[PDB]
Ligand SMILES: O=C(O)c1cc2[nH]c3c(c2cc1Cl)CCCC3
């Protein structure tokens with residue numbers, strides 16, 4: 001194996017493939033697979049559940065072959081080299097030698113034959129969509145995912161195809177987020193759970209260019225194709241909850257308010273809320289919302305806002321962190337809070353769009 | 366106590382006094398004459414800020430949580446007026462239609478530092494004191510049992526102010542002329558107070574006493590206790606005669622160190638240096654049998670030798686230097702090495718050799 005590549009053509013691909021890799025349990029998991037074949041350098045990083053592949057064209061003389069080298073060490077060397085540095089790489093048995101100017105580097109290798117290989121799988125549904133659409137879908141729901149839960153299925157994100165739309169669903173049991181976006185393609189119905197790190201990697205590969213994203217989904221796998229990068233991940237088997245049964249059936253009390261004004265009022269009030277439970281009180285009356293928070297230290301905050309509201313008065317408690325999470329994810333001018341009573345969930349949406357909806361459970365305080 | 370003041374005039378002062386026991390997490394607010402005074406402390410050091418009050422005000426003093434009162438004022442929108450009044454066991458904060466009642470502790474209970482006399486006084490530009498601290502800060506010890514090293518020596522001599530810092534493995538010296546005739550004096554400022562003095566940096570007026578150090582800049586006053594101990598003489602740490610002189614490009618030397626370090630030992634990162642005529646070879650290796658080598662064009666001419674260095678110690682020096690050319694003054698394979706900028710003698714750095 002032999003290749004010479006300019007620093008900047010190797011740098012970003014190296015960062016991408018290293019994504020799925022802190023403390024590797026076994027030595028080979030800390031390594032990247034390098035392959036030179038048909039004038040192309042393929043790089044691969046894995047964690048047994050997912051793979052990130054980068055393909056790099058070779059304009060300089062090269063020789064076929066494959067080896068694995070430490071990801072972090074090889075990335076650090078290339079990054080450390082000066083801009084425009086020519087990086088000559090050759091496999092020499094047990095070591096891979098890296099040369100650039102009068103800089104010399106020798107890396108430990110493990111056989112390419114020993115590198116983990118995710119089994120082949122048959123695609124069942126395929127569609128293309130803009131990178132921006134995928135970014136929107138992930139950023140709207142990502143925060144609602146559970147962290148290291150025993151209910152493994154909640155630690156991921158549901159991906160749903162229905163009609164002309166692609167949909168994401170995330171919930172941690174306490175609060176729910178759901179976002180739908182049209183893609184202009186007739187789709188069958190699949191409901192697959194994408195793991196936590198898979199959601200991160202999907203988000204990582206969107207460089208904000210106009211390169212379309214090609215998505216393939218199977219019974220047990222998902223694949224995402226952006227530019228010269230191919231991401232494959234195994235899916236999480238389980239029974240993910242339906243969002244249609246979590247959405248409030250009867251929201252009779254609709255409140256409309258400025259998103260940023262609601263956000264900054266909640267943020268100021270949060271300062272004096274209970275440090276563990278993060279509870280804020282909401283009193284809603286005609287065209288006005290009052291936000292109050294108190295902690296065991298006997299401290300009190302109060303905020304008063306002009307809103308649009310015609311319904312009956314009610315008092316309701318919320319975990320302020322959940323509300324602030326929703327409002328930061330919406331990033332719009334006007335927000336809509338769909339209420340029922342003090343013991344039922346709220347539905348929070350963008351006032352101008354039904355494409356995203358949020359459900360937060362009420363709180364006793 | 367009662368005052369109404371613009372948000373703009375509180376933001377900067379609040380940030381400075383929240384720099385440095387339950388009462389230590391609070392800020393002392395005093396209203397006297399036509400001034401609001403804000404004080405934060407950690408028992409060792411103290412930061413006082415003054416802000417003028419033109420709106421109807423009432424004199425008095427209380428204490429309120431530092432992080433909370435700051436987060437409230439900063440959380441409010443720009444152009445907001447902030448009305449504050451003490452009402453029994455609570456301080457009421459009002460702006461627009463935002464209300465805040467914070468828990469209080471009496472002003473009489475707030476820990477004030479003992480009164481002390483100034484023995485040495487001098488004024489110097491902000492940029493000079495920044496320069497003096499920046500050049501030596503990294504060489505301070507962190508949690509060493511030798512408490513006198515957990516800080517920085519401030520020395521006056523002739524017309525110069527000098528900072529010295531050492532962790533026993535590497536030492537840093539920097540001298541700057543301030544244009545004033547000074548008495549010879551040395552004091553040790555605690556590392557926490559050193560970093561605080563750095564953040565507040567229009568001349569700075571400095572007052573040094575037997576057990577305290579004070580700094581006046583703008584409308585802020587920083588007072589800190591001194592570390593009571595005997596600090597090592599830098600004059601005896603500098604090598605007697607480093608006859609071997611290596612001159613290298615600062616950035617090239619930096620990058621060649623950072624790249625080689627990648628393949629050194631993860632626990633104690635060191636590189637080997639082979640010096641010959643107009644060439645420097647930087648090598649490194651690890652328990653995985655991995656090797657790095659960096660060849661550099663330099664200016665030397667002296668005798669060939671091999672010497673190892675801790676990567677972090679050298680990089681720290683080169684990052685402080687921020688210059689074109691670095692001069693490395695060597696003696697032998699087992700002795701300390703002096704590092705300086707090639708064009709200036711203001712700063713000197715001494716690093717122990719490392720065995721690899
Ligand atoms: O390596 C050196 O030149 C060196 C020598 C030193 N001798 C002493 C210290 C010291 C530091 C260095 Cl860097 C600090 C504590 C007092 C005695």
Ligand SMILES: [Ca+2]
Pocket residue numbers: 092095096097106
């Ligand atoms: Ca080799």
Ligand SMILES: [Ca+2]
Pocket residue numbers: 374415416417
């Ligand atoms: Ca003022």
Ligand SMILES: [Ca+2]
Pocket residue numbers: 582583584585
């Ligand atoms: Ca000032």
Ligand SMILES: [Ca+2]
Pocket residue numbers: 639640641669670671
């Ligand atoms: Ca030699």
Ligand SMILES: [Ca+2]
Pocket residue numbers: 637671673720721
């Ligand atoms: Ca050696």
